Every structure is written in C-alpha cells, then in structure tokens.
Amino acid sequence: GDDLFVPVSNFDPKSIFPEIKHPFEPMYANTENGKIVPTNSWISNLFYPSADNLAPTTPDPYTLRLLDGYGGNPGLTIRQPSAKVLGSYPPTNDVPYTDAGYMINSVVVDLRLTSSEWSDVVPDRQVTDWDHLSANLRLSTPQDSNSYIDFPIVRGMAYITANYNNLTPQFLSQHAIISVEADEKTFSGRKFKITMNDDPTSTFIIYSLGDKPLELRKQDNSNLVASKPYTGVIRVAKLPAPEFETLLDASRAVWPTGGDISARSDDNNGASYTIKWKTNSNEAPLLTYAYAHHLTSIDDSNVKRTDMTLQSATKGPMTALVGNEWTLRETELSPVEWLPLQAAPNPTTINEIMTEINKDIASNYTQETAKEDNYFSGKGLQKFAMLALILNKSDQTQLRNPELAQIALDKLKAAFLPYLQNEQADPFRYDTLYKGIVAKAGLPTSMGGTDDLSAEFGHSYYSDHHYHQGYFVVTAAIIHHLDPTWNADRLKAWTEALIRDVNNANDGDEYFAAFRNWDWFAGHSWAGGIKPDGALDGRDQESVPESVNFYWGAKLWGLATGNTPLTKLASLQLAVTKRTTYEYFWMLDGNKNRPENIVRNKVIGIYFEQKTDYTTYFGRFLEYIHGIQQLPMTPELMEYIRTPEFVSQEWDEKLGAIAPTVQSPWAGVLYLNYAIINPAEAYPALRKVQMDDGQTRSYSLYLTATRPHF
Ligand SMILES: OC[C@H]1O[C@@H](O[C@@H]2[C@@H](O)[C@H](O[C@@H]3[C@@H](O)[C@H](O[C@@H]4[C@@H](O)[C@H](O[C@@H]5[C@@H](O)[C@H](O)O[C@H](CO)[C@H]5O)O[C@H](CO)[C@H]4O)O[C@H](CO)[C@H]3O)O[C@H](CO)[C@H]2O)[C@H](O)[C@@H](O)[C@@H]1O
Ligand SMILES: OC[C@H]1O[C@@H](O[C@@H]2[C@@H](O)[C@H](O[C@@H]3[C@@H](O)[C@H](O[C@@H]4[C@@H](O)[C@H](O)O[C@H](CO)[C@H]4O)O[C@H](CO)[C@H]3O)O[C@H](CO)[C@H]2O)[C@H](O)[C@@H](O)[C@@H]1O
Ligand SMILES: OC[C@H]1O[C@@H](O[C@@H]2[C@@H](O)[C@H](O[C@@H]3[C@@H](O)[C@H](O)O[C@H](CO)[C@H]3O)O[C@H](CO)[C@H]2O)[C@H](O)[C@@H](O)[C@@H]1O
C-alpha cells in the first residue's frame, strides 16, 4: 500500500521561530546517544527525580517505581494491581447522580529486585536507551559502574527482566512470602515459585537464566538473598492462575527489548499498523500482554490469544498474546472532511441561519481571537473559521452570499495573521533540547517568560500541544483550502511545524521528536508533559475532543495540500482514537474495563496512567465534566467520533436531567451535543441558550439543521 511514517516536511523551524534551549533538562538521560527525550510518553518519568522516588512507570500490567524507600534495600519495585480502591467526594447537587468519584491503585510493594551490595548505598541510575515502546534503565553501584543491573522495560511485558552484572540478587516484599518451591522439588535452582499472604494471593515465579543456578536464603519474612554475586539474566513473572505455569515456563528464555512500528494504508479505505517486537532471541515464543482495543482490532492470522489475563492500571484486563508481530487494522476510516455529511441544512432554517451568520460575522474578530492566551485564542479562530467555511462552500451548503463569504474569509485572515507571524500575546519558540515548539509564557524571566511553569496550561513544559495547536491547524487548513495562494509559503512552513511538533511520524525529520503526543500501544494521545516534582500518577488526558480536533486539523491539512500519507495517517489515528475512546473513556453500557458504578458515570473524567478522577481541572460541576467531552463540536466529532448510541445513553443517565437547568454557556455545549440525537428539540433551545466562547449560534443551528432526522 502506502507508507504513513514519512516526514511531513524537513523545513528548518529555526527560520520561523526564535531559538531556545529548554531550561528544565532531563536528569538521567544518556547524553552520548543522540536520541530525543520524550516529553509526553509513558517512559518520561524515568528521566527525572520525583518526590520520595514514588513517580511510577507503567508498561502494564506491571507498575514500576525506582528506588522508593520502604521494606529495605532500594531497587526496581513491582506493583501488579489485581484490585483497585474506589472513592467519592462529599455528594453534591452540582454532581447529581454520583457515588463513585475516582479509581486508584494502591502504592504497595508486591516485590522488588535489588541486591545486598545496596544495603548501605543508593544506586546510581541512567536510562541508557529507549524507543517508543521501551526504555533501558540501569542501576549501578556508585564508583563501581561495572556492578549494575539492566532493566529492559517494555510495553506489555509478561515478566520483569533484570540482567545482573557482578551483583548479588536480592528479592523483597511488603508482604510475607509464605512459601518457596524451588525447581518444583535455603533454596537452589533456576526456578522459584513464591506465594504472598496478600489478597488476592500473589504468586510469582523467579527464573535465573545465567550460567549458574541461584541459591537463595530467607534473610527475613520478605527477603530472599543470593549466596554470591550473579552475572546473567533473572526474570520474575506474576502467575496469574495455576493453569498458566507451563505457559510462563516455556517463554522464560525470551524477553522483549523494544519494538519497531510501521504503518500502511490499504487500497480498500483502511489502514493498519505493525508493531515488530524486538527480543533477545527467537528460541521460544514471545508472550506479550495486550489492551482491550488490541483484541478487537488485531489481525489474528499471526498471534495466539491465551486466557492468561492480568489487570492493567486503568484500562481493564490485559490478555497475553503469543507472537513476534502485531498488525492492528482499522478498516473503517472516517469519511468526514470539511462539512457535515449532509452538507445542506433543512431549508426552512436557511433564513434563520443567514440572519445569525450575519450577526456573528459582524463580531470583532480581534477582540474575540486575540485573547490572554493561545488556547482561548485558538478557540476563537476555529469558530469563525467554521463560518468562513460554510459561506465559501455554498455550492454544497446552499448558503449563498458572495459578499458575506468574502468578508467571512478576509476578517478571518486578518485575525489569523498575527499568529502566522508569531506576534500574538504568547508567541512560540523552537526548542532545541526536546526538539519541538514551546509557548514563551511559562519560561523563565531570563527568557521573556512569566517564570510560572503553569502558564498557558503547561504548554511551555509540553502539556496540551495537541489541544492548543489543533485549533491553529484547523484554522490554517481551512484558510489554505479556501485561498491556496494567500501567504502560501509562510503558511505551509508554520502550519507544518505545528503539526510536526505534535505528530512527526518519522525521525529522519530530525528537527522534531517523533509522535510527541501519541502513544501507539495505548492507542490514544497524552496531554500531560514535563512535571518538575514528578508525575505521581503518570500521563493524563482530559479532553478527547481536543485531541480529535488536532488529527482532524491534520487530516484537513492533508486534504488542503494533497498530502496523501498525511491524510491517511491522520485517519488511522482518528480510528484508533475512536476505538480507545469507547474502550476506556466514554463508557457504553457493556463496558468491562471499569466497575459498574464508574461506568454509570458515562465518562471517565480526567484520565491518568495510575488513576481516574470524575472531576475537571476547572470546577466540579456535572456540565463541565461532560461538557469538555463535547467541544469543539465539528463534523468530525458530530458525524464520526460521538455516536448516537453514546449520546443517548449519556443523556438518559445524567444529562437530560440537568441540561434545562444550566444557565452558563455550558447549555450551548450540551444542547449542541443533544442535537446529535434530537435536533428537533435541540434546535429551539440553541435559538436561545448561551454559546461557549468557541461555539457560534449560526454554526450551532446549521449543524443541528443538518442532522438528517430533524
Ligand atoms: O467555566 C468555568 C471556568 O472555565 C475556565 O475555562 C475552561 C478551561 O479551564 C478548560 O481548560 C482545559 C484544560 O484543563 C486542559 O489543560 C490541562 C491543564 O488544566 C492541566 O493543568 C493542571 C492545572 O489546571 C491544575 O490546576 O494544576 C495541575 C498541577 O500539575 C496542572 O496539571 O494540565 C493538563 C496537562 O497535564 C492540561 O491538559 O486542556 C485545555 C487547555 O489547555 C482545556 O481543554 O477548557 C474549558 C473549555 O474551553 C474552558 O471552558 C475559565 O478559564 C475559568 O475562569 C472559569 O471559572
Ligand atoms: O476556583 C478556585 C481555584 O480553583 C482552581 O481550579 C481547581 C483545580 O486546581 C483542581 O485541579 C485539580 C488538581 O489540583 C489536581 O492536580 C494534582 C496535583 O496537584 C498533584 O500534586 O498531583 C496529582 C497527580 O499525581 C494531580 O491529581 O488534580 C485534580 C484531578 O485529580 C484536578 O481536578 O480541580 C478543581 C475542581 O475541578 C478546580 O476547581 C484554579 O486552578 C484556581 O486558580 C482557582 O482560583
Ligand atoms: O477535583 C476534585 C479535587 O481534586 C483535588 O486533587 C486531588 C489530588 O490531590 C490527589 O493526588 C494524589 C495525592 O494527594 C497523593 O499524595 O498521591 C497520589 C498518587 O499516589 C495523588 O494522586 O488525587 C485526588 C484523587 O484523584 C484528587 O482529588 C484538588 O486538590 C481539589 O481542588 C479538587 O476539588
């Protein structure tokens, strides 16, 4: 087919944006290797110190922590959460139908690999290599660097692999080790089945795969200690049930070291992506835990499903797959482009629409798009961009008015130009340390910043780039599609740099980190960037529709430029996005990935690697929580991402009971969502309710009047 991991461009962003070097540097990165540190990846906590060494790294189904200081010697700590704690906030009328408010994973030390040589010392640490799907973490004795353990940490791994080099294995737990079967016969051999007194019972199997066998001694209720330094690989795996023991034994010799991802489009309107797992050897089968969405989209013709499951941190049960390669297919790409699928409104609404569209174009674009920050500014531009788009495709929308179409396009251009030109209130800088673009606002005073990292929503520390830049890309592509010659060079360069910051698919584009905001294993985007202090719960994502908005923009930029691989790339990602959204974030009845009483919530809230919280970053009101999952409403969100089956379920459980009471512009959001399933009733209400600062009344009514069952 057609290869999707290509560069978008190779243009030098130093030609558009002033240059900087990010002030906040990784701490533990191997300087000598010439790989870019990811700012929004599930590996990212590894590059940084954190409060009490508690920040987690979650390949899943294992949670890892490094050098946390509890039941003795410091090492690699394992938590494999069979169960989870639920919790609520004191009940409110602001949150009417809710008992379950959050799901967390207890920070407990199921087991920990370390050594005796580290009783009286803290190990040095370094991430020696990494890729999209793995990182290698070395722990060595201080000023004895030849005395180390290497931890190849890989997405989905079924065991933890420790390569001990001249260091004396020590295993410990918070729990009592209530028995030790060595070689299924002080304890000796190459296999060690240990059982904990925790609940559910944890069983691990330790395997030594070096030259010599291990000899271990119970030093305390939770310490097994080797008899002399070991050199060679140890592995430990959780035994999920008695019947998978042969399974873990057979695959003990083979461990993952990383992985290669490619992706192609398939002539019959589909695309796919392949993870080629990298391993130490092919001498036994590769066991790899998969997420739910993996199961529903993998090409079975090359894996074997097992029944061996373990819970992940926040995604539901994981199921182990046997096989070296995974090809994940998305066969139903979005057909959405610029307009809704039914492009022309119910005609008896056209007069109303035009009237409204004329009041809206009379708005002051500068004052509605030159806001305190980039985020709300971008909201403003995309909203008017929509108006310029429907007037200038009157061919399809049947909204003819040459003179207003021209105005709607000109006023947009004049609004958008200061951004094109990087003269907005919070301009960008090209960052040469992490290879992306950052807003100036949150940088130090000594670089023109406010010295406040939380400024512009964390964007200076790489939070929210898909959210913020999605707005500018949709606006850029809309402009470029309606006027391909207006500032064409500068427009391409700039727009493509923003795209590249978020979603560079190819690292021969060496100006930008690859897939800054996108995670090929989880099948979704991460919002949360660098957190100086530590990301105690890993990556977070709030808004799904601001992620969707970005890839929509990217697709639109593909259409606007005739860029096929880009257009398909963006489509594949919107498919995988759809699939993960329904698996983990917008819960249809029948969802196995969450407790019954979180599913009743209908939306996950703020999603993290180690928790879920039913709340927002900006107020605990029902309509905020659900509202953020409903803007920007665009043809992508409307036609393709938010299904009628989901809108209906969400309406009936929570929202139809509070929406007629809401007086803030949150009404406007809500009833535009409601139009998805009942535009007859939504329309009258959108005639009168308030608009979110990124919604217009004309577009709200036009969209509503295009629902084909109006
Ligand atoms: O209408 C009532 C109030 O509405 C506000 O406008 C809304 C606006 O808040 C909302 O923002 C969304 C962001 O949450 C999201 O950005 C995330 C960050 O918020 C979050 O940073 C948190 C920080 O908020 C918290 O207080 O401290 C944390 C400590 O680390 C910090 O992490 O981090 C996330 C990355 O990890 C980041 O994604 O994303 C978007 C903007 O960046 C928004 O979608 O958006 C709503 C929809 O437009 C707004 O309505 C008003 O400003 C208030 O004045 C009103 O009272
Ligand atoms: O309205 C008055 C003032 O309220 C502020 O808005 C709050 C908002 O700050 C709050 O956000 C919370 C976060 O505080 C919290 O972040 C956690 C970190 O602080 C902690 O150290 O790390 C963990 C992860 O390890 C983070 O959870 O996280 C929760 C989600 O778990 C966020 O909701 O939420 C409030 C209710 O929605 C909201 O009212 C605002 O920022 C002030 O300026 C404002 O004046
Ligand atoms: O939005 C509701 C409410 O949220 C509050 O945020 C808290 C966080 O403080 C908390 O973060 C945890 C730490 O307190 C703890 O020590 O470490 C763990 C990791 O092991 C952290 O997750 O998370 C809870 C539950 O999700 C949140 O309620 C805000 O302070 C408050 O303003 C807001 O109203």
Side-chain angles (χ1 to χ4, degrees), residues 46 82 111 196 257 367 373 387 428 492-493 517 549 558 619 632 644:
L46 294 175
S82 284
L111 196 83
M196 265 62 174
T257 72
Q367 292 164 5
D373 61 38
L387 302 182
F428 301 127
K492 189 196 170 67
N517 288 87
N549 194 51

Side-chain angles (χ1 to χ4, degrees), residues 89 102 107 536-537 611 613 615-616 620:
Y89 309 98
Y102 64 86
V107 181
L536 292 209
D537 295 293
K611 74 185 184 182
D613 203 331
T615 192
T616 72
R620 263 212 107 215

Side-chain angles (χ1 to χ4, degrees), residues 35-113:
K35 284 188 168 185
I36 311 155
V37 179
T39 54
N40 306 65
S41 156
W42 74 279
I43 76 172
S44 298
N45 281 348
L46 294 175
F47 293 100
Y48 298 108
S50 57
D52 289 295
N53 290 304
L54 290 181
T57 288
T58 311
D60 257 333
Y62 304 112
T63 285
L64 313 164
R65 296 188 163 81
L66 291 298
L67 323 176
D68 59 297
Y70 198 93
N73 292 349
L76 182 55
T77 292
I78 306 146
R79 172 72 189 114
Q80 208 301 294
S82 284
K84 347 225 141 215
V85 180
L86 299 207
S88 29
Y89 309 98
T92 8
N93 195 48
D94 301 335
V95 202
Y97 302 94
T98 321
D99 68 87
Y102 64 86
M103 190 170 76
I104 40 163
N105 295 275
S106 73
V107 181
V108 163
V109 177
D110 302 330
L111 196 83
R112 179 190 282 164
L113 299 90

Side-chain angles (χ1 to χ4, degrees), residues 359-371 373-463 465-467:
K359 309 188 202 171
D360 287 350
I361 280 139
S363 307
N364 184 320
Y365 289 28
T366 324
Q367 292 164 5
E368 291 210 37
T369 67
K371 255 128 204 327
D373 61 38
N374 280 343
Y375 171 73
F376 289 102
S377 281
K379 275 179 71 149
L381 304 157
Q382 179 154 327
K383 94 200 192 177
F384 291 118
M386 294 307 209
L387 302 182
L389 189 58
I390 76 178
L391 291 163
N392 286 272
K393 286 166 115 42
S394 76
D395 21 293
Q396 302 174 236
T397 68
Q398 311 173 33
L399 301 186
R400 241 156 324 269
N401 189 328
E403 225 229 268
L404 191 61
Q406 184 68 43
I407 289 155
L409 190 36
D410 289 342
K411 292 186 68 160
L412 180 67
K413 317 220 209 143
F416 175 79
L417 192 58
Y419 296 86
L420 178 45
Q421 298 278 62
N422 208 37
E423 304 298 340
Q424 69 269 26
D426 182 24
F428 301 127
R429 294 295 187 263
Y430 178 58
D431 167 29
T432 54
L433 183 53
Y434 299 106
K435 308 292 180 223
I437 87 181
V438 294
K440 198 179 92 217
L443 291 174
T445 297
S446 51
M447 298 182 210
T450 71
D451 231 282
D452 174 16
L453 82 219
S454 79
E456 189 71 78
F457 298 93
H459 186 284
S460 279
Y461 283 64
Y462 285 100
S463 295
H465 290 209
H466 57 349
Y467 297 168

